[PDB]
Amino acid sequence: LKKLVEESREKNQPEVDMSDRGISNMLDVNGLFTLSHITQLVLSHNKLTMVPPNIAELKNLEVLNFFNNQIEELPTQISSLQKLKHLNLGMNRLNTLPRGFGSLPALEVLDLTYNNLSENSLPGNFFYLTTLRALYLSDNDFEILPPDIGKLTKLQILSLRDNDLISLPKEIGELTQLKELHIQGNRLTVLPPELGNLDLTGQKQVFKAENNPWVTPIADQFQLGVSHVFEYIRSETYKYLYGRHMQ
Amino acid sequence: GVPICGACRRPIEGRVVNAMGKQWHVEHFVCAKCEKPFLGHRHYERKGLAYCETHYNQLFGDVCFHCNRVIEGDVVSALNKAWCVNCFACSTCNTKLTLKNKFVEFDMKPVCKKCYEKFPLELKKRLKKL
Ligand SMILES: [Zn+2]
Ligand SMILES: [Zn+2]
Ligand SMILES: [Zn+2]
Ligand SMILES: [Zn+2]
């Protein structure tokens, strides 16, 4: 570990790979936080339980990967990374995010897959992350997706696979750039008609919704195909039935 | 009679541009983005409209999932997305990849075989059934 730091400063290597090296504490990696030049840091598959505030010193980070550690909380300093575009916090033990996490000004891909997050885990300014184009929330404990999801206007990918959602917010219909919506494995029975404003029937698009207790006509339409589903939830018939299902 | 321009609906007495099933005056056949006339330079077509090369690539070129730029050079196509050759990499460990690698699909992201092996058993069991 003292050779991936020294060689990175001698040959000016912007990318640091410390995947699967049995690291239990970032402060124990000699000289790691002196490498202010680096733009990529990979610490996936280690034994981290925390991230120190020193993370802010790596001010040029564009890619930061903590996939598959045991991280239980993050320092507020995580959001001072002005150049951060990719952040992988997947497969950890997060049930909260720190104050002001939504202050990251350049974040494009945020991966929070397989943690212990719910809507209450998100800070008040989470949806200030308007530069996001991919948000992965798979394998978490969301029951309700906040309507401010609609503020993420550049979002192309949204995964809510295997959460606890009882409803989808109609504001998802405001995501005009969306290409992928993953909602398998929740507790959804109906779709909001406003989803029909979107079109996810394209070859390059994805709409995965299996393993939900859909009402029979929606389940039936899935069995016919995604084109039929979207045609149906746009129909006057569905709108009539949806209005009565809600009341 | 003589051809008629498709943009101004007037007769073309002199030199004629033949493009997209229509005839045009040289000055009236332009890029749809920037209003600049091609003047002999190659044009590129998209949905009945003509574009210059720079603007054609900007609007319709494949965009890299990693660096979010219009890809120059060879494109790696996988999982309904596109990467620069030098950008294509594992989503969980960022090791560079080619299509010759045996990676798995995880929420439509590439995950290398070595990384997938490290996934929790309960997850891997559910993903198989999906
Ligand atoms: Zn003309
Ligand atoms: Zn042009
Ligand atoms: Zn790229
Ligand atoms: Zn990998």
Author numbering:
A (entry chain A): 5 to 251
B (entry chain B): 189 to 318
What does the paper say about this structure?
Ras suppressor protein 1 (Rsu1), a leucine-rich repeat (LRR)-containing protein conserved from human to worms, was recognized as a major FA component and is important for FA formation and cell motility. Among the IAC components, tripartite integrin-linked kinase (ILK) associates with another two key players PINCH and Parvin to form the ILK/PINCH/Parvin (IPP) complex, which acts as an essential platform to recruit many proteins for the FA formation and signaling and provide a linkage between FA and actin cytoskeleton. Here, we solved the crystal structures of the Rsu1/PINCH1 complex and found that Rsu1 strongly binds to PINCH1 through a large concave surface on its LRR solenoid. The cellular data supported the inhibitory effect of Rsu1 on the IPP complex. These results indicated that Rsu1, by interacting with PINCH1 and preventing PINCH1 from binding to actin, modulates actin dynamics at the FA and thereby regulates the stress fiber formation and cell adhesion dynamics.
We prepared the Rsu1/PINCH1 complex by combinatorial usage of the purified fragments that contains the elements necessary and sufficient for the Rsu1/PINCH1 interaction and successfully obtained the crystals of the Rsu1ΔC/PINCH1_LIM5C and Rsu1/PINCH1_LIM45C complexes. The complex structures of Rsu1ΔC/PINCH1_LIM5C with one crystal form at 1.65 Å resolution and Rsu1/PINCH1_LIM45C with two different crystal forms at 2.2 Å and 3.15 Å resolution respectively were determined by the molecular replacement method. In the Rsu1/PINCH1_LIM45C complex, the nine LRRs of Rsu1 form a curved solenoid capped by the helical regions in the both N- and C-termini, named N-cap and C-cap, respectively. The N-cap consists of the α1-helix while the C-cap contains three α-helices (α2–4). Both the two helical regions cap the LRR-solenoid by forming extensive hydrophobic interactions with LRR1–2 and LRR8–9, respectively. All the nine LRRs adopt the typical LRR-folding by using conserved leucine residues to form the hydrophobic core except for a few short loops inserted in LRR1, 5, and 9. Consistent with our biochemical finding, the LRR-solenoid of Rsu1 interacts with both the LIM5 domain and the C-terminal tail (C-tail, folded as a α-helix) of PINCH1 through the concave surface of the solenoid, mainly formed by the parallel β-sheet and the flanking loop regions. However, the LIM4 domain in PINCH1 adopts different orientations as observed in the two crystal forms of the Rsu1/PINCH1_LIM45C complex, indicating the intrinsic, structural flexibility between the LIM4 and LIM5 domains. Interestingly, although separately distributed at the interface, the polar interactions are well organized together by forming a hydrogen-bond network. In this network, two buried water molecules, conserved in both the Rsu1ΔC/PINCH1_LIM5C and Rsu1/PINCH1_LIM45C complex structures, critically coordinate three clusters of the polar interactions as highlighted in Figure 3D.
